Design a protein around this ligand. Sequence first.
Ligand SMILES: OC[C@H]1O[C@H](O[C@H]2O[C@H](CO)[C@@H](O)[C@H](O)[C@H]2O)[C@H](O)[C@@H](O)[C@@H]1O
Ligand SMILES: OC[C@H]1O[C@H](O[C@H]2O[C@H](CO)[C@@H](O)[C@H](O)[C@H]2O)[C@H](O)[C@@H](O)[C@@H]1O
Ligand SMILES: OC[C@H]1O[C@H](O[C@H]2O[C@H](CO)[C@@H](O)[C@H](O)[C@H]2O)[C@H](O)[C@@H](O)[C@@H]1O
Ligand SMILES: OC[C@H]1O[C@H](O[C@H]2O[C@H](CO)[C@@H](O)[C@H](O)[C@H]2O)[C@H](O)[C@@H](O)[C@@H]1O
Ligand SMILES: OC[C@H]1O[C@H](O[C@H]2O[C@H](CO)[C@@H](O)[C@H](O)[C@H]2O)[C@H](O)[C@@H](O)[C@@H]1O
Ligand SMILES: OC[C@H]1O[C@H](O[C@H]2O[C@H](CO)[C@@H](O)[C@H](O)[C@H]2O)[C@H](O)[C@@H](O)[C@@H]1O
Ligand SMILES: OC[C@H]1O[C@H](O[C@H]2O[C@H](CO)[C@@H](O)[C@H](O)[C@H]2O)[C@H](O)[C@@H](O)[C@@H]1O
Ligand SMILES: OC[C@H]1O[C@H](O)[C@H](O)[C@@H](O)[C@@H]1O
Ligand SMILES: OC[C@H]1O[C@H](O)[C@H](O)[C@@H](O)[C@@H]1O
Ligand SMILES: [Mg+2]
Length: 580
Amino acid sequence: SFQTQHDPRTRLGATPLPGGAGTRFRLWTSTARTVAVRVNGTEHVMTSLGGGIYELELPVGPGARYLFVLDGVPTPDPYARFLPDGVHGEAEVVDFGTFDWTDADWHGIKLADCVFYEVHVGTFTPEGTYRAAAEKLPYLKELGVTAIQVMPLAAFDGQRGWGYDGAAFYAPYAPYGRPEDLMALVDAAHRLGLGVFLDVVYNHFGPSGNYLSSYAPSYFTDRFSSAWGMGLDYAEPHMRRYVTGNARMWLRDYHFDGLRLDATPYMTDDSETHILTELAQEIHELGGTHLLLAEDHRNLPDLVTVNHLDGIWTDDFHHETRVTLTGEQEGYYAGYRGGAEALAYTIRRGWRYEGQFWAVKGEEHERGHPSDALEAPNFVYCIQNHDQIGNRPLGERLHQSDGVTLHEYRGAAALLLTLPMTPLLFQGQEWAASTPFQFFSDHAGELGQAVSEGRKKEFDVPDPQAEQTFLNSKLNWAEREGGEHARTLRLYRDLLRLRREDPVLHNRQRENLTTGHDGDVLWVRTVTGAGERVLLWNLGQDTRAVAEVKLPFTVPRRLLLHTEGREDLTLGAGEAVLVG
Ligand SMILES: OC[C@H]1O[C@H](O[C@H]2O[C@H](CO)[C@@H](O)[C@H](O)[C@H]2O)[C@H](O)[C@@H](O)[C@@H]1O
Ligand SMILES: OC[C@H]1O[C@H](O[C@H]2O[C@H](CO)[C@@H](O)[C@H](O)[C@H]2O)[C@H](O)[C@@H](O)[C@@H]1O
Ligand SMILES: OC[C@H]1O[C@H](O[C@H]2O[C@H](CO)[C@@H](O)[C@H](O)[C@H]2O)[C@H](O)[C@@H](O)[C@@H]1O
Ligand SMILES: OC[C@H]1O[C@H](O[C@H]2O[C@H](CO)[C@@H](O)[C@H](O)[C@H]2O)[C@H](O)[C@@H](O)[C@@H]1O
Ligand SMILES: OC[C@H]1O[C@H](O[C@H]2O[C@H](CO)[C@@H](O)[C@H](O)[C@H]2O)[C@H](O)[C@@H](O)[C@@H]1O
Ligand SMILES: OC[C@H]1O[C@H](O[C@H]2O[C@H](CO)[C@@H](O)[C@H](O)[C@H]2O)[C@H](O)[C@@H](O)[C@@H]1O
Ligand SMILES: OC[C@H]1O[C@H](O[C@H]2O[C@H](CO)[C@@H](O)[C@H](O)[C@H]2O)[C@H](O)[C@@H](O)[C@@H]1O
Ligand SMILES: OC[C@H]1O[C@H](O)[C@H](O)[C@@H](O)[C@@H]1O
Ligand SMILES: OC[C@H]1O[C@H](O)[C@H](O)[C@@H](O)[C@@H]1O
Ligand SMILES: [Mg+2]
């Protein structure tokens, strides 16, 4: 008995009409006195319906170019489905019904079956497009990942960017390709049995290209702020529907399997039904098997158990692992000791902070909640992602940080990919890629200069606005063929195959997972009806024989995988083994 608030008949923007009758244009404005649509250069006055709603039907079809004219001012459509000339230009009318999908036998993917692979379309290939990315899908399938996690695609200003400056949420960023190129990428992924997930940003709009306030200032509020402007007012139903209609488009019209919601703590809403709950209702109304994940630092199980999201990106594991390997203590890393004992605890508890004091200077509070309600798949774990690489001054990867060996890097992979939690890898991680992932942008004018200055002051640091910073972040695919890159890749393939094939690692219950330590050796034990596995990781500087590790059970005898391919049950510094 939840009923969607959305009806194609009243859809804001430009929507093709049935029977080849053309396009219906609709907008909401609280302040304009005159309202017109300019289509292929010709202006037509729109009909006032009440409630600030304006409408017009014209015989123009998909491909027509338009914007709205508010009190004589040409203004881009916030509901644009494509912006071929960028965020300050005319929109194109898009018809989602003409693409020939071939994925009728694809029925989504469960979270417990996801191994995420985070892609940035612009850097993932030389071309930096969907079409070039699609040619890497067979590689990803063979690698053994099961779900692609795409960084944000909403149109933003400039010729490159991470995606978090998105401003026109319904319009896929034109430099990556046209709408049908994105559909082709999803269709190709589904053919190979891969899920595709999209990063969406419903806590803020980027600084350039967001014209919502030109239509109605009340989309936003001064009660609080975003990084770029006034806060998104979820007490305003039109604002709620902007984001729920967007989520529905990505899932229904582009066939995405799920969404990753950026910075959910900053989707502020005091409404009786929280916007996160309504998002879940609205996407579930579509009647598929779509997933919703939250990027949330609050260690708050209610996101799953009350808002009915599927899982949470939970960084305590990542942070505990990084501190273990580097000793670093700047910023939020000061929240963690690291080490075998510490890692055993964080895994045991899912996340570390369950209400205890977070003593990080500038952020002091009682952080988190008991994790008991959450099951292993509800936690998304990683040792690398876009933020944990790119928010570093030089954008260096884990194996490129001072004091980290390739042996330690490979051990960390074994830990991540044998846990029952839902893992995520960042593009190129699997071959210990040589290239950084730096923060880059391409804003115009004074805003561009402010970005460059802001980055300098925050922390030489690579200028985010420089072309070189973007190019230096491009993946080098050929390097995976050789040397330590190939060795690391061989290990990732072996780990992913085992995750897939090993009947005990199929465990997805925290009841069946225990952890502990002996000195600097971490152990992780899984026991099910199918048998027993133990992962031992030597986080020390010395060599440790598995037979001398003190354990509260008898260690299994069979060596299933050693991260350095050794024959004997001995762990050099940083090395790991899986036994059964
Ligand atoms: O929903 C798609 C399929 O998901 C599962 O299979 C995928 O995920 C597994 C666990 O990560 C992988 O081992 C496997 O290679 C993938 O195909 C599920 O087992 C299938 O029944 C689903 O059809
Ligand atoms: O039409 C004026 C400008 O409106 C938008 O910019 C406002 O909203 C941004 C947040 O999305 C703020 O960062 C900015 O300071 C505001 O002016 C739009 O993004 C701009 O392109 C317009 O010029
Ligand atoms: O304030 C947020 C919520 O806090 C509690 O829920 C969390 O902590 C509980 C135990 O203290 C757990 O049982 C629960 O799974 C956590 O989400 C409180 O019980 C909730 O009502 C609050 O919404
Ligand atoms: O060497 C001085 C530091 O010793 C500890 O930190 C080391 O040991 C931790 C495990 O207990 C590792 O996670 C960490 O990477 C090491 O640097 C101590 O915690 C630090 O406060 C000391 O400065
Ligand atoms: O994880 C605790 C911190 O979470 C948020 O910080 C960021 O999340 C990533 C690091 O965990 C960052 O790289 C990203 O830029 C933020 O979303 C929170 O903002 C911090 O205050 C916490 O210390
Ligand atoms: O496929 C989801 C479950 O897979 C495993 O459990 C299955 O196989 C077990 C053999 O050890 C049986 O005990 C169990 O009845 C089967 O569901 C995995 O161990 C579970 O955690 C998953 O939920
Ligand atoms: O309360 C002190 C510690 O108790 C646990 O650790 C002990 O028991 C584990 C399981 O037998 C062993 O792995 C470990 O070596 C013992 O010290 C708990 O796991 C730790 O977090 C506590 O610090
Ligand atoms: O901090 C936790 C709380 O944050 C927000 O106020 C949410 O609306 C509420 O559901 C949640 O309990
Ligand atoms: O200092 C105020 C702190 O309180 C909070 O609830 C947030 O978790 C933290 O990010 C913030 O900095
Ligand atoms: Mg000992």
